[PDB]
Structures are given as C-alpha cells and as structure tokens.
C-alpha cells in the first residue's frame, strides 16, 4: 500500500511521460506521411 | 483512499491501453511511410 501506492502512481507518472513521448513521435510520423503524400501527388 | 486508490489503478489501466494503442498507430505509419519513401525513391 504505502509502497504499493508510491509505486502505483509512480507507474502512471511513468505511463503519462511515455504517452507524451508516443504522441510526439506520432505527430512527427503523421507530418512525414502527409509531406510524402504531397510530394508524390505533384 | 478507496476512491483515490481505485482511480490510480484505473488510470494505469487506461494509460496502458492507450499507450499500447499508440504503439500500433506508430507501427502503422512507419510501415506506410517506408512504402511511400520506396515509391518516391524508385
């Protein structure tokens, strides 16, 4: 509990940080996807 | 708490689901972008 809780929400601070990371990578891959599409259509 | 303690394990579950979902989208785009690069490429 005391160590469960600490490590439980310890886990979400980690899960949220990981989520932000993934979101930033996603954004980058999406921009690349769209620019490639634009280059190819022209 | 009880309310608090159910909301951290729940937040861990949702974060896990969401982060696993994000990893799939990442895989999808990496695969589409690699193909688009090959097309642009050759």
UniProtKB/Swiss-Prot annotation, chains A, B:
Its main location: nucleus. GO terms for cellular component: nucleus; protein-DNA complex. Phosphorylated by CK2. Shows a stronger interaction with COP1 when unphosphorylated. However, phosphorylation does not affect its susceptibility to be ubiquitinated. Ubiquitinated by COP1 and/or CIP8. Ubiquitination takes place in darkness and leads to its subsequent degradation, thereby preventing activation of photomorphogenesis signals. Ubiquitination and subsequent COP1-mediated degradation is triggered by SHW1 in the darkness during seedling development. Ubiquinated and degraded in response to cold when reaching an accumulation peak after 2 days; this proteasome-mediated decay is promoted by prefoldin co-chaperone complex (e.g. PFD4). It comes from the Eukaryota. Keywords: Abscisic acid signaling pathway, Activator, DNA-binding, Nucleus, Phosphoprotein, Phytochrome signaling pathway, Transcription, Transcription regulation, Ubl conjugation. Disruption phenotype: Reduced sensitivity to abscisic acid (ABA) leading to impaired ABA-mediated reduction of seed germination. Abrogated induction of DHU1 in response to UV-B. The double mutant shw1 hy5 has altered root growth, hypocotyl length and hook angle similar to the single mutant shw1 in the darkness and far red light (FR), but shorter hypocotyl in WL, red light (RL) and blue light (BL). In addition, shw1 hy5 is recued for gravitropic root growth defect observed in hy5 single mutant. The double mutant dhu1-1 hy5-215 phenotype resemble that of the single mutant hy5-215. Induction: Accumulates transiently within 2 days in response to cold; the proteasome-mediated degradation observed after accumulation is triggered by prefoldin co-chaperone complex (e.g. PFD3, PFD4 and PFD5). Residues 8-36 are annotated as: Leucine-zipper. It is found in: Nucleus. Residues 3-42 form the bZIP domain. Coiled coil: none annotated. Homodimer; homodimerizes via the leucine-zipper domains. Heterodimer; heterodimerizes with HYH via the leucine-zipper domains. Interacts with COP1 WD40 domain. Interacts with BBX21, BBX24/STO and BBX25/STH. Interacts with SPL7. Binds to SHW1 in the nucleus. Interacts with HDA15 in the nucleus. Interacts with PFD4 in the nucleus and at low temperature (e.g. at 4 degrees Celsius). Transcription factor that promotes photomorphogenesis in light. Acts downstream of the light receptor network and directly affects transcription of light-induced genes. Specifically involved in the blue light specific pathway, suggesting that it participates in transmission of cryptochromes (CRY1 and CRY2) signals to downstream responses. In darkness, its degradation prevents the activation of light-induced genes. Involved in responses to cold conditions probably by modulating the expression of several genes and triggering anthocyanin biosynthesis. Belongs to the bZIP family. This is Transcription factor HY5. It comes from Arabidopsis thaliana (Mouse-ear cress). The lineage of its organism: Eukaryota, Viridiplantae, Streptophyta, Embryophyta, Tracheophyta. The gene is HY5. The chain holds residues 111 to 150 of 168 of the full protein.
């Amino acid at each position: 509990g005391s160590a469960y809780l600490s490590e439980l929400e310890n886990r979400v601070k980690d899960l949220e940080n990981k989520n932000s990371e993934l979101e930033e990578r996603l954004s980058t891959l999406q921009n690349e996807n769209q620019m490639l599409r634009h280059i190819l259509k022209n």
